[PDB]
Amino acid sequence: MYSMPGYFQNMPTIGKELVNPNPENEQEIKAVESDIHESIKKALDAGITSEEKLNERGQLSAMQRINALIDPGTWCPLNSLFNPENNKFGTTNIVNGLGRVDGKWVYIVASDNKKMAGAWVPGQAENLIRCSDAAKMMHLPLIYLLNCSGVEFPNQDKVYPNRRGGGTPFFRNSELNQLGIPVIVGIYGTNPAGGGYHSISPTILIAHQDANMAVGGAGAEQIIAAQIENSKLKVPAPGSVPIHYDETGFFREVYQNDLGVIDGIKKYISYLPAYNLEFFRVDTPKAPQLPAEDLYSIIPMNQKRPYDIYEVIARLFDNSEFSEYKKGYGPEMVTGLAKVNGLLVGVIANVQGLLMNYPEYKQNSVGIGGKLYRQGLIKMNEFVTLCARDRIPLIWLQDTTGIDVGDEAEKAELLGLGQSLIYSIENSKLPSLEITIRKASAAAHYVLGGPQGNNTNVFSIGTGACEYYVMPGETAANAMYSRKLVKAQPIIGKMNDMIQMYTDKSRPKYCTEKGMVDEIVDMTEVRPYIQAFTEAAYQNPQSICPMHQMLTPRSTREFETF
Amino acid sequence: MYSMPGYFQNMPTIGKELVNPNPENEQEIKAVESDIHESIKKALDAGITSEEKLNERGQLSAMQRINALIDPGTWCPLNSLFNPENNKFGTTNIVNGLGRVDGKWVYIVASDNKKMAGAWVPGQAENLIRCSDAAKMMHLPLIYLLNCSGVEFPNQDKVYPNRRGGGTPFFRNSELNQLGIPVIVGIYGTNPAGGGYHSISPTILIAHQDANMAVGGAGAEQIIAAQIENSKLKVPAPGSVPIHYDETGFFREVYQNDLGVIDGIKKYISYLPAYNLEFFRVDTPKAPQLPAEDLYSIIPMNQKRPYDIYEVIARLFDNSEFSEYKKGYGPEMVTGLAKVNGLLVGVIANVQGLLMNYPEYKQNSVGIGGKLYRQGLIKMNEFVTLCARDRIPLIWLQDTTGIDVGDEAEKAELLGLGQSLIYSIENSKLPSLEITIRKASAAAHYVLGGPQGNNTNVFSIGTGACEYYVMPGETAANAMYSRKQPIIGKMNDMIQMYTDKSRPKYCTEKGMVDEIVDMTEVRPYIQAFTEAAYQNPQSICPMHQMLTPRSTREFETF
Amino acid sequence: MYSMPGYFQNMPTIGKELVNPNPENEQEIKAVESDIHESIKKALDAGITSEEKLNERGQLSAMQRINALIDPGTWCPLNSLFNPENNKFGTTNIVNGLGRVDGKWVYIVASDNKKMAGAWVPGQAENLIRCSDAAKMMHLPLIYLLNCSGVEFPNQDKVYPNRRGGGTPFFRNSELNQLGIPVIVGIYGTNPAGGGYHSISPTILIAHQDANMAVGGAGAEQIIAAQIENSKLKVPAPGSVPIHYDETGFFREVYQNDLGVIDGIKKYISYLPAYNLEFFRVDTPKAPQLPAEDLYSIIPMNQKRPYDIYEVIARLFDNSEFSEYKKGYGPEMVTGLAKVNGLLVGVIANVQGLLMNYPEYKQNSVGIGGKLYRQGLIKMNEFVTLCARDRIPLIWLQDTTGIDVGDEAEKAELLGLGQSLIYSIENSKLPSLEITIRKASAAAHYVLGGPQGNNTNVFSIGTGACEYYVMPGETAANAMYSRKLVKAQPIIGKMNDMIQMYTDKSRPKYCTEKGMVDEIVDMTEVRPYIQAFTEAAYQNPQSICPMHQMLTPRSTREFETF
Numbered sequence A, C: 001m002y003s004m005p006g007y008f009q010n011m012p013t014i015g016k017e018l019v020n021p022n023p024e025n026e027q028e029i030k031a032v033e034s035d036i037h038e039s040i041k042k043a044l045d046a047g048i049t050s051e052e053k054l055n056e057r058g059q060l061s062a063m064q065r066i067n068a069l070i071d072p073g074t075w076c077p078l079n080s081l082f083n084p085e086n087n088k089f090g091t092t093n094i095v096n097g098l099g100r101v102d103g104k105w106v107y108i109v110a111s112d113n114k115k116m117a118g119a120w121v122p123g124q125a126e127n128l129i130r131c132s133d134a135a136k137m138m139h140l141p142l143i144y145l146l147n148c149s150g151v152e153f154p155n156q157d158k159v160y161p162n163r164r165g166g167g168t169p170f171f172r173n174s175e176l177n178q179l180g181i182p183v184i185v186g187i188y189g190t191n192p193a194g195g196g197y198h199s200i201s202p203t204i205l206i207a208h209q210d211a212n213m214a215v216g217g218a219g220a221e222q223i224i225a226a227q228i229e230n231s232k233l234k235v236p237a238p239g240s241v242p243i244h245y246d247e248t249g250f251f252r253e254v255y256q257n258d259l260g261v262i263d264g265i266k267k268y269i270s271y272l273p274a275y276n277l278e279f280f281r282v283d284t285p286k287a288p289q290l291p292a293e294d295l296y297s298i299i300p301m302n303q304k305r306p307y308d309i310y311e312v313i314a315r316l317f318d319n320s321e322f323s324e325y326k327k328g329y330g331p332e333m334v335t336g337l338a339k340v341n342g343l344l345v346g347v348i349a350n351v352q353g354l355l356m357n358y359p360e361y362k363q364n365s366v367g368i369g370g371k372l373y374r375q376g377l378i379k380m381n382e383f384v385t386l387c388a389r390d391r392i393p394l395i396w397l398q399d400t401t402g403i404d405v406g407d408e409a410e411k412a413e414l415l416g417l418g419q420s421l422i423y424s425i426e427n428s429k430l431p432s433l434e435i436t437i438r439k440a441s442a443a444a445h446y447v448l449g450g451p452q453g454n455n456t457n458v459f460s461i462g463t464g465a466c467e468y469y470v471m472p473g474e475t476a477a478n479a480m481y482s483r484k485l486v487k488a489q490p491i492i493g494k495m496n497d498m499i500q501m502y503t504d505k506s507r508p509k510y511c512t513e514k515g516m517v518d519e520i521v522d523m524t525e526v527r528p529y530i531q532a533f534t535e536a537a538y539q540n541p542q543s544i545c546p547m548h549q550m551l552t553p554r555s556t557r558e559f560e561t562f
Numbered sequence B: 001m002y003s004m005p006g007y008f009q010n011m012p013t014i015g016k017e018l019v020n021p022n023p024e025n026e027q028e029i030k031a032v033e034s035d036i037h038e039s040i041k042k043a044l045d046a047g048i049t050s051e052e053k054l055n056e057r058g059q060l061s062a063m064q065r066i067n068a069l070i071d072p073g074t075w076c077p078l079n080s081l082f083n084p085e086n087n088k089f090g091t092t093n094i095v096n097g098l099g100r101v102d103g104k105w106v107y108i109v110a111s112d113n114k115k116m117a118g119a120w121v122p123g124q125a126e127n128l129i130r131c132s133d134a135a136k137m138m139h140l141p142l143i144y145l146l147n148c149s150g151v152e153f154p155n156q157d158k159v160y161p162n163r164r165g166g167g168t169p170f171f172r173n174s175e176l177n178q179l180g181i182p183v184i185v186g187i188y189g190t191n192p193a194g195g196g197y198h199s200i201s202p203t204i205l206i207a208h209q210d211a212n213m214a215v216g217g218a219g220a221e222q223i224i225a226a227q228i229e230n231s232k233l234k235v236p237a238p239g240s241v242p243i244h245y246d247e248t249g250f251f252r253e254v255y256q257n258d259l260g261v262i263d264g265i266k267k268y269i270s271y272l273p274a275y276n277l278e279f280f281r282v283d284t285p286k287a288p289q290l291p292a293e294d295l296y297s298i299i300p301m302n303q304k305r306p307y308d309i310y311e312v313i314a315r316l317f318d319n320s321e322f323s324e325y326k327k328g329y330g331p332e333m334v335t336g337l338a339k340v341n342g343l344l345v346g347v348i349a350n351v352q353g354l355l356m357n358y359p360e361y362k363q364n365s366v367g368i369g370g371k372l373y374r375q376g377l378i379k380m381n382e383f384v385t386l387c388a389r390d391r392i393p394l395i396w397l398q399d400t401t402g403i404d405v406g407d408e409a410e411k412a413e414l415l416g417l418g419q420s421l422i423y424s425i426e427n428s429k430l431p432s433l434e435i436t437i438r439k440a441s442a443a444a445h446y447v448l449g450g451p452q453g454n455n456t457n458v459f460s461i462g463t464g465a466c467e468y469y470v471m472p473g474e475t476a477a478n479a480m481y482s483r484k485q486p487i488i489g490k491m492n493d494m495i496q497m498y499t500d501k502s503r504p505k506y507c508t509e510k511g512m513v514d515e516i517v518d519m520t521e522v523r524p525y526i527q528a529f530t531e532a533a534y535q536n537p538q539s540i541c542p543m544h545q546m547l548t549p550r551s552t553r554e555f556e557t558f
């Protein structure tokens, strides 16, 4: 039932059974993961109105609405801890990520109605753009579970104006619509002004019977007097159901309770165009042959230690199968085709450890795994270009310390080749996933399908072993202060300040808090995200290459045989 | 020598000669303007290495490089005071804006080498994106005068990572290239890592003979020892001319001094495709019939005072001519075609003052100028859609206090119609200029061709009479605290804080508006924008195939 | 003054000095060329009104207007002999091709006012579409020297209706405009209805003082009476200058005579955006090191004879330099980068002669040059894909007898690989030139950047040694009638009818008459056309790859060294 099994089935298998577990390493990784989960929990529960109080007066929390909406176990939260401005509640007042609904993947945004009635808080605008961007790049339906009181008044200057403030998503919703990507909103509670526009910008509007959307809402001693004297009229909240259902017909449908709204959304989701993924499969979905739990021993928290990348790839992709492009050329990178629930993806991943007698442009040299050289860069360039032609999404597994430096490296074209890769990625036009296994550092972070490719990277996730910095604090301390040491003790103070500050500001939690990485995910959650991404990417792709017309597999084969 | 003079020449003229100057108003506006210029000056001069010291060792400052590059008097700086993170030096370490080069408009980005050798500072990445974005939307060549030491080490966490950090411009440069928009870099001084990529991402590389671009540069007591012992070798800065000219050939050309580099850039700029603007003209360029200085009396700093928008439009556009679309329908807005150096633009501007017997969906009502109603919204929708079809760039003059509120307004479809306008703008696909005359407030700021339309708004500028807020502090204080003595404290805290954080300078510092420009600089920017937009447009509507003028005429006669 | 001389300058040189001329071969080719020129001459001079009579009453012929418009010696006519419907005059009543105007290449269409006042004749619509298509694909300004009386009344059914009839160009002109490509028209003489629309559809209208454009023009015994009684009024031809200049302002400018109109057009052409080609050069323009006249000896008219393709490539491209991609892999094809007036092009060309010990999927086999095999097809696929990424236009030199047949070939994926190439070409999105050196046959004609790629092939030209057929008449005779032999003299009659008919209908002149190839060009005109194409393609390209970000040269180098 599949094309070209000779190419796409029974690929080389990779990975060993884990013979030597590392409980202490596992304990270190799980400690990071636990801290993320506790922080996510503490953040979701924060706010003046609890889930309990919400339920008492007939409303569901953001997570209850999501869990009601999605197929159980398909929640891939993104930006859970995103809090670039340090809001007290620890979030941006939206919950967002990928969920599956009766088999259809959709991007989900839910207003956190526990916190200031879903108000726009600092950082929210940016958070929201990352949502509509992901949807845009994947051509994936965007679902708003809206309960939004608009601009948080004290912070208006940070949430109301500017190119990428609270007004932007409404343009982004129109762009999704114009690109042919539907937006569905469940309207809950009071949605004035900023909330109103969030209500009116989507394609389909499903309202709670008590909900409203409006250009403006109901919002010294006389001021208190006027309030009760203007409340005794029982004048209705502007733009309630009798207005936007009965008069304007802007609300297409109206339900009695939150779960009704969710059902309405489900119905409209069921209307949306989506391939049966079977159409794009080259194999029946198969689990990896090696357990993901091993990743807790395989990927070392001791950043000085290498590890075999193949052991990671064997645990993330179907059947631990892998079809490497140009094995032996560019030994610092692994580039090859794999399968995620039967679907083709291109994988690009750093190789760790020492590389004897390499790179070829240096005499008597040893290459450092995690670094990028001429062959690695050209190989990736070719591979990205091949995958682009073939409409094969790229998954980048980053663990990098940069492109090789020095005039020998410069003469090898390395700067040009790294940028050539950037060019290749931008030319690819396909949605891409970036997974930071450990190190995201140097310009290599950018060129390795980094999140700086705003047209291609849908989002990025990291494991608990991950860290982000320009370069290690010690290298940066030398780079920053060495010459000032020769100009002239307060300067060595500054150097230790720097080494410390680089450690502090490169910890997984901080990184995702600032959004350098969208989500820290458990080692056992990496594949689930890959699966969510790949299936979302193949749901309604905007371009097709028939398998028998794909070049990547052919060029791969030829490099093997010729 | 022009198509359809019956439509495009001798349009109705508008505006009166200013009979009653307002010296006190003028003084208030000019005070704001003076404070901007002084702040811009103080910011450009800040940094450890002065223009003087730069010149002594053979280098030009960012502004010297720009002024050498551009036709004199064509500098339209943007983001002069942009400093969202409050860097001490007051800037993002880049100077940027529109300049003209031998008649060709180009977007210019110059590294401020006065400050940490042009290092990436907090806010810079965002600043840079606004540059490549402007270029992208206008299909305008982007010029880098590069002197960039890469990531500022202490602030690496704010300048190195993330979707829109320092790595983003390199993708943006590839996108410009792939969209067919050339990037030209003059490479100066040391450009390692972050600087290297800024050097290598553009289309054309012109290098100073002492310059370098590299993946990585040269960058307890032993550390100082190793330095002098590693400096005695006189080992060359990685990726210098002998490497990137003589070996890789990545530097296409190499010059002896800064002005040589500038000449190289000029030569390559001269290679770039550009219409003679005469091609798109419907008239010979004419100054307005009324002086711009009048704007200092016309546009009131007293925000409670109205003014006649037509008096502004008469002073910004060629010959004070204006061809209004649907005059009398949607009286709260003026929408119509005008001319900027002979080129057609669509103008959309708020009308101020009371509007007797309006809106039509209310009994015995008076409409507030600066607000948006059913007819205004539909009219703008139609006008934007018409101009889009006709490939006519839109210039929005904002002075707004929002769309009308209340259930009567809701039944009039107002929410839907504001969003419909957002849809129309996004559908338009053309580059657009937004000018905040005074008030940028409410969702109206967004729908009136706001900078939130990231695919259409190239950038936005404001006059000294401008201010940005969700709503006035007093209205916000009621909205925030009404339902709730420490509470009246908070309300005055809010009214004050809204005043503080809505002043022109603050607004542009945060980048809510890209530049505060002098009243006499508004037209120059309009001229820069329009001419840049018509230089190499990606789409054409022949004048005789334009709908806007036809539909306009028909509304007048039928 | 150029990027990366190490890659782009001092490429390997190719080709030998011609030691053994072949005068008889030369004579055979030049005979074909002479017949083309005579036919083109006879066609241009045909019509009831001569150039002499035109000049007497103040008008220029199409060729006079073109020659006036263009830089001398830059005329590249296309479709000179295009006459699919066999019109008596031998043409489609338009003259078209590429001309250069003060350094700017433009596509030119001129109404043949010698023939029924520039009326729409059968085949014209198609001819016109090829013009707007070329302009569209190259993003090249389109110039109309219009003198058009609209639909030829007796042939209205063939020139007026249908998806690709006389109304289509007006839509095509709007599409060019919407794509950002300007159309300039010089309006001459009477242009009613069909002519009117041709006048009004362009961007810029320059009128002759006596010209008109109109929805409708002035057009038993009483009918003759009404004519003189309706002519005595001296009622002006509808839509003359007083109307379309003085009233509507549709004519932007008006000139006294034909050369004035041409000067108007020149002025507006001077307004058009165009790179100085220096911007895209990687070298200073250099002539080939070997003379093109040699082509008359090199390319054999005896179709059974091979020849060295390198000798052709050495004579068509700058300095006889060539940078071959994957030399030794896919030995049946040459694919590599070359220079045309300093500008990078990708060249793909058939290798002729026997290929010992090939293809690799057959035991004890000899490959036929001119045929396509696994490595050739994969190589081309890669090369096209590489050049697409790099924004390097492709020039295909076709001399082909098809992809290899048989189940061995089928197992080698040949069908899929040929179609993969079609996919690659369509993915390339760049303008492409196709030159038929000799044989355009089999599906190979299609996959080798054939004119069937309506989004990529701007047009196609052929030498006098060229010929087009599905397969040779003798092979086709067997294929058609062999089985009808076994089933059963009238059948061998039919076989000779076929062999003859295939010869007749595959001669260069017939081929271009039908438009299978757009123009038969002299051996010494091939490079000029390449030069016209390349410079037009680089004039205002819609996409750029910076040289230091180009992959083709890097991947080429690596295949050479690794």
Ligand SMILES: C/C=C/C(=O)SCCNC(=O)CCNC(=O)[C@@H](O)C(C)(C)COP(=O)(O)OP(=O)(O)OC[C@H]1O[C@@H](n2cnc3c(N)ncnc32)[C@H](O)[C@@H]1OP(=O)(O)O
Residues within 6 Å of the ligand: A049, A115, A116, A117, A119, A148, A149, A150, A151, A152, A153, A154, A160, A189, A190, A192, A193, A194, A195, A217, A218, A219, B442, B443, B444, B470, B479, B480, B481, B483, B484
């Ligand atoms: C261009 C766009 C501009 C804008 O968006 S302008 C902002 C317009 N927004 C409003 O008018 C909202 C006024 N709010 C209500 O009516 C809000 O009670 C509401 C009607 C929702 C919600 O009222 P509830 O009775 O349902 O109370 P909740 O538990 O859901 O939350 C209310 C609580 O959250 C906080 N809250 C709610 N909205 C905001 C905001 N916006 N900012 C800061 N804090 C907020 C505040 O502590 C509120 O207390 P009160 O003021 O006493 O009601």
Ligand SMILES: C/C=C/C(=O)SCCNC(=O)CCNC(=O)[C@@H](O)C(C)(C)COP(=O)(O)OP(=O)(O)OC[C@H]1O[C@@H](n2cnc3c(N)ncnc32)[C@H](O)[C@@H]1OP(=O)(O)O
Residues within 6 Å of the ligand: A442, A443, A444, A470, A479, A480, A481, A483, A484, A487, B049, B115, B116, B117, B119, B148, B149, B150, B151, B152, B153, B154, B160, B189, B190, B192, B193, B194, B195, B217, B218, B219
């Ligand atoms: C992904 C990309 C990552 C990156 O970009 S990593 C950053 C790589 N950058 C470097 O290695 C630059 C090291 N700098 C030099 O060699 C720099 O002297 C330099 C070679 C330029 C410039 O040296 P000059 O001798 O020309 O001195 P300048 O007046 O131009 O400015 C130097 C001065 O500016 C400041 N400066 C310069 N660069 C930086 C930076 N980057 N951060 C903070 N502050 C800086 C600093 O006070 C410097 O003093 P010293 O350290 O004593 O030289």
Ligand SMILES: C/C=C/C(=O)SCCNC(=O)CCNC(=O)[C@@H](O)C(C)(C)COP(=O)(O)OP(=O)(O)OC[C@H]1O[C@@H](n2cnc3c(N)ncnc32)[C@H](O)[C@@H]1OP(=O)(O)O
Residues within 6 Å of the ligand: C049, C115, C116, C117, C119, C148, C149, C150, C151, C152, C153, C154, C160, C189, C190, C192, C193, C194, C195, C217, C218, C219
């Ligand atoms: C959807 C679009 C539909 C259409 O285009 S409908 C066609 C509308 N066309 C007309 O009405 C053209 C009528 N022609 C004139 O007025 C034409 O004399 C004319 C005004 C040009 C040209 O008249 P001239 O006096 O300049 O004579 P010319 O030497 O340029 O050529 C005229 C000659 O060409 C021939 N001719 C010209 N036009 C046509 C056409 N169209 N078909 C066939 N043959 C034609 C014919 O033999 C003509 O002889 P007359 O009929 O005695 O004038």
Ligand SMILES: [Cl-]
Residues within 6 Å of the ligand: A401, A402, A403, A404, A442, A443, A444, B215
């Ligand atoms: Cl790097």
Ligand SMILES: [Cl-]
Residues within 6 Å of the ligand: A215, B402, B403, B404, B442, B443, B444
């Ligand atoms: Cl509003």
Ligand SMILES: [Cl-]
Residues within 6 Å of the ligand: C402, C403, C442, C443, C444
């Ligand atoms: Cl074939």
